[PDB]
Amino acid sequence: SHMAKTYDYLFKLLLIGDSGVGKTCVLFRFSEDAFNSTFISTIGIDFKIRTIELDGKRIKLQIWDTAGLERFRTITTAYYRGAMGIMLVYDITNEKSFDNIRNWIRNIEEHASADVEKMILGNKCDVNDKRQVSKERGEKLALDYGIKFMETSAKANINVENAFFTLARDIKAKMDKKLEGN
Amino acid sequence: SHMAKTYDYLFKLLLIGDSGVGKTCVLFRFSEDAFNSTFISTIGIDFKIRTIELDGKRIKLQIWDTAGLERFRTITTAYYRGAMGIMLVYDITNEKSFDNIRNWIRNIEEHASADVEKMILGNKCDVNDKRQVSKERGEKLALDYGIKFMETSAKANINVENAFFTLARDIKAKMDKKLEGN
Amino acid sequence: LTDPNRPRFTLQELRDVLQERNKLKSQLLVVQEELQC
Amino acid sequence: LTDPNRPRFTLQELRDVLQERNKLKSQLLVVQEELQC
Ligand SMILES: Nc1nc2c(ncn2[C@@H]2O[C@H](COP(=O)(O)OP(=O)(O)OP(=O)(O)O)[C@@H](O)[C@H]2O)c(=O)[nH]1
Ligand SMILES: Nc1nc2c(ncn2[C@@H]2O[C@H](COP(=O)(O)OP(=O)(O)OP(=O)(O)O)[C@@H](O)[C@H]2O)c(=O)[nH]1
Ligand SMILES: [Mg+2]
Ligand SMILES: [Mg+2]
């Protein structure tokens, strides 16, 4: 329909990581500020949209939420090439979902832009009694890869806002230095 | 949102019959007045909406287009209970799709309202050279079941308008005599 | 099992996405009609 | 093969419906935003 747009930037984001780590719940906390405890695993892919403000500019965030289960891999693959930032999510109560982060990283390296912005979320950081992945170990992984990390909880609403704005701010800053230098 | 409606009636219609007889093409001729020759088989179910005028009243038609292929049977079943009129479509160039009409009729008798309005469409009636089902035989089938019949072509646009208005008019007339007599 | 037509997804999986597809199309036609402004 | 979790539909079948679901949701959010009247 070719009408004037109501945003200045458009950031395509991608959440990836194993089934059940809480990717959908983290996005629904960011986009609706709600939390449902019942598991509704993501069939293939879904998306949510939120517009935020950075340095007084309108940033539309088109956030793509992939299925973690193996049978959806070909479907979710199609969504890597366009992403500008990617949340790699694991579950602090599940060591496998954290070991698998380095597989998710290799997946990105195979399918995404060479310079995509990456962040690690250790989610469910409200379930201390069941913790398997120390906070120190998530930090050293992300340091080993030179990318940012934080512990999140969609349920207790911990670091969800901060994760997306930080990733949004880092995409914007790199983009602005590209646009300015062209 | 509880807002004033822009129709006086709402008729839920169902197209059923074998895969490839032209159910989708008949609906796309009714709702868009177009015809595409390439086959895009219907995944499960789809629907189209058109509002027509009868006796000076606004009739919203919510037309449900089922998949004919066997693997979608449980999916399409859910849509029988609410239908008010049903197009049973066969392909004049395919005897099997016409023999199978009496299976489609038994399907209706198992799943739809006892008094649902039924019509037989012999579609592709523009392909004379490949005809297998004589027009006389479609007529005697529909007479055997006391329901209306016509030969249609979505491609040459034959009897598509007439089929839906007639079915719409017969639903409306029976409904009005019910509403009046209550 | 390298076959493109291998059956892979369940009734539940397909029917859920279809039902959402219907709900969205239905809602979109409503808000499109809401535009007589 | 009476099993609810029997695999039944193809990649093509599911991905097509998903892509339409996305297109519809995208269009619906647009026409919803178009309502600041
Ligand atoms: N206590 C707690 N539970 C959570 C949290 N995040 C998610 N959950 C629960 O963990 C389960 C899995 O969460 P989802 O967001 O559906 O997981 P997912 O990563 O989207 O899984 P897939 O779509 O299958 O890839 C759900 O039952 C959630 O309620 C959290 O921060 N804290
Ligand atoms: N010549 C001619 N071809 C037609 C006509 N109607 C449909 N076709 C062709 O027949 C093929 C099947 O038509 P569809 O409408 O897709 O069939 P369908 O009944 O919806 O099949 P399913 O969705 O699989 O149940 C398509 O390639 C059409 O182009 C017609 O009236 N005349
Ligand atoms: Mg999910
Ligand atoms: Mg069809």
Numbering used by the authors:
A (entry chain A), B (entry chain A): -1 to 180
C (entry chain D), D (entry chain D): 125 to 161
Give verbatim excerpts from the published study on this entry.
Rab8a is phosphorylated at a threonine (pT72) and subsequently binds to a phosphospecific effector (RILPL2) via its C-terminal RH2 domain. The C-terminal RH2 domain of RILPL2 encodes a Rab-binding domain (RBD) that adopts a parallel α-helical coiled-coil structure. Here, we show that recognition of pT72 involves a dual arginine motif involving R130 and R132 from the RH2 domain of RILPL2.
The structure includes residues preceding the X-cap that were not mapped in our previous work. The biological heterotetramer is generated by a twofold crystallographic axis down the length of the central parallel α-helical dimer of RL2117. Although the RBD of the complex begins at 117, residues 117–125 are disordered. The model contains residues 126–161 of RILPL2 and resembles closely the minimal RBD (129–161) of the previous structure (pRab8a:RILP129 complex). The complex with the extended RBD (RL2117) has two well-ordered stacked arginines in which R130 appears to stabilize the conformation of R132, which directly forms a salt bridge to the pT72R8. As a measure of the close contacts, the distance between R130(Nε) and R132(NH2) is 3.4 Å. In contrast to the other complexes, pRab8a:RILP117 forms a symmetric twofold axis down the length of the coiled coil.
